[PDB]
């Protein structure tokens, strides 16, 4: 049959123009009294997926 994509990954990630994967950040929904303003200012910028994670993740997102 066909391969099924991981529907939980696809709701969380997107594919950039040179093949990468933009991602959101953690520690960004919850107790902000436990973290500094500089931390929460700098946890507002997106990032990318690392090479260890991508090697193990590649096949689940092949089609979207």
């Amino acid at each position: 049959p066909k391969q099924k994509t991981h529907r939980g990954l696809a709701k969380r990630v997107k594919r950039t123009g040179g093949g990468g994967l933009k991602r959101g950040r953690a520690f960004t929904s919850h107790r902000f009294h436990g973290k500094t303003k500089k931390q929460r200012r700098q946890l507002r910028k997106a990032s990318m997926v690392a090479k260890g994670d991508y090697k193990r993740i590649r096949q689940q997102l092949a089609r979207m």
Partner: protein, 146 residues
Amino acid sequence: MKLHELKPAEGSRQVRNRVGRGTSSGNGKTAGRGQKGQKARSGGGVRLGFEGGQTPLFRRLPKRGFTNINRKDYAVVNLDTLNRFEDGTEVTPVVLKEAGIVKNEKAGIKVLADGELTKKLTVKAAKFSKSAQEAIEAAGGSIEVI
């Protein structure tokens, strides 16, 4: 070519690897699998993306956004592609098709200015960026959103 002297091209066919056929081949006795463990069993292995029991990377990250149901995507053609027409032609979505430049015009054509025109066209399309229309009109033609 005669049917008793066939020859494929070099590098085009390779043979095959058969495991479990003696020691000297390199892959007898456990056939490349190492010693014991879950990965040495028939049907052994863990599912894709599994990580032991640590919280998997998809599950620490938050979800994001929504899909719009009235989304419009267009079928860009820039400015070099309008150089393969004669000086004065009235380029249009049916003359773009039937040259194969555009097949599958999603929600209509949109012209983009990247980067250089020298013709006398009169372009008919659904959308124009500010610089596409501009450079089209410098070279000496006209636009009409339709």
